[PDB]
TrEMBL record, chain A:
In the N-terminal section; belongs to the phytochrome family. Mg(2+) 2 binds at D14, I15, D58. This is histidine kinase. Residues 9-147 form the Guanylate cyclase domain. Mg(2+) 1 binds at D14. It comes from Limnospira platensis (Arthrospira platensis). Mg(2+) 3 binds at D14, D58. Ca(2+) binds at D14, I15, D58. It comes from the Bacteria.
Length: 195, 199
């Protein structure tokens, strides 16, 4: 539990289209959609042994390599799997909310995922009033920024991550001058399916 | 922690700082951890004393609720929230001072820490979100977006509130009123920067 510098893999995944689609539905329905979603995303993380740090609205933050130790390679492999697995759950969901009037009648829901790996102080943070497990540092910023920057329905990763990823699975490369970062960063959109 | 999602009138408060890793850049990891907590430790005390709820921590950001899970009059909601922000803004100056004199800031040119707070009141489906495997207490909806956006938009070391909130605030305590068009919102919104001090 106690905060410490460790090498971990952060995964952020947010959606775009929620608000507007539930725009119709009495909060009640809205809650039904969000939980459904969250229920899914969570499944993709736990099945791939990751840790669900937190939920920031419709955003999911997940860790790999903390609290439980995990090899930097297993970290990138499981962070990737979740991302692709999550992409499959939405399709499965968007398919159901479509056929149901919660979508299509309000564009279907879009997905944005960004993953990064690097050092980050990992521990319990907060105080007596409230204290949660989470990572903190420039590396967390990075992953997050990577996720806000990638195209809709895509997965973007840092070079640190891509080095574990087969070459032909990397769709597109590009340096991004991420806020607060001096050194522009090399980003990689990875194929959303595999090999 | 057993509350199923329900619409409700609550007051959301978001407060974020700036000068963390920059200041902490000046220390090794455990150094930031010792620092971040000192901060949060204070931020949270300002929420609890004013009887607010601490939804979550998003890094150096604090999300706090007023009017959930515990019922609270829309007026008490705005009074306890405003107070909290005012109390927060003072401890910051109190902290910065501590750090400056500690050489964590105002040295190796890491400017002292800045604060951003945005508050709004409105409807929001409050409750446990997620699913059996995982679910947390939080509010969801356009009203949450609003507060958050209000906080990202206000100047450094300032408190910005929506009209919905300002109507409970004495007129002379409102430094500025100005329409700012927020993302995803059709109707531009009337914002109010309130005096960081009472009266
Ligand atoms: N329950 C919650 N906890 C924390 N932050 C929340 C939240 N609900 C909303 N927010 C904040 O409100 C803002 C939500 O706006 P956006 O993330 O831009 C929605 P979007 O991704 O553009 O489309 P969407 O509304 O369909 O998801 C974010 O800045 C988020 O941090
Ligand atoms: N523990 C955590 N949980 C969730 N999100 C986190 C996080 N730590 C960092 N982040 C994310 O990383 C990003 C941090 O970027 P910023 O908030 O812009 C830093 P800043 O406000 O410019 O000043 P700073 O460098 O002192 O932090 C945010 O989008 C935040 O949500
Ligand atoms: Eu979103
Ligand atoms: Eu910040």
């Amino acid at each position: 539990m106690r905060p410490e510098p460790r090498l971990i893999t952060i995964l952020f995944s947010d959606i775009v289209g929620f608000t507007r689609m539930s725009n119709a539905l009495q909060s009640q329905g809205v809650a039904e959609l969000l939980n459904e979603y969250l229920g899914e995303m969570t499944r993709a993380v736990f099945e791939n042994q990751g840790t669900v740090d937190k939920f920031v609205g419709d955003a999911i933050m997940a860790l790999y390599g903390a609290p439980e130790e995990m090899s930097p390679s297993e970290q990138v492999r499981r962070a990737i799997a979740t991302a692709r697995q999550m992409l499959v759950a939405l399709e499965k969901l968007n398919q159901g909310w479509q056929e149901r009037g919660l979508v299509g009648r309000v564009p279907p829901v879009r997905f944005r995922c960004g993953i990064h790996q690097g050092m980050a102080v990992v521990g319990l943070f907060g105080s007596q009033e409230r204290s949660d497990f989470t990572a903190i540092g420039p590396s967390v910023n990075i992953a997050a920024r990577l996720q806000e920057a990638t195209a809709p329905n895509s997965i973007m990763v840092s070079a640190m991550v891509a080095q574990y990823v087969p070459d032909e699975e990397i769709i597109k490369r590009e340096f991004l001058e991420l806020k607060g970062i001096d050194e522009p960063v090399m980003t990689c959109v990875i194929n959303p399916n595999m090999l």
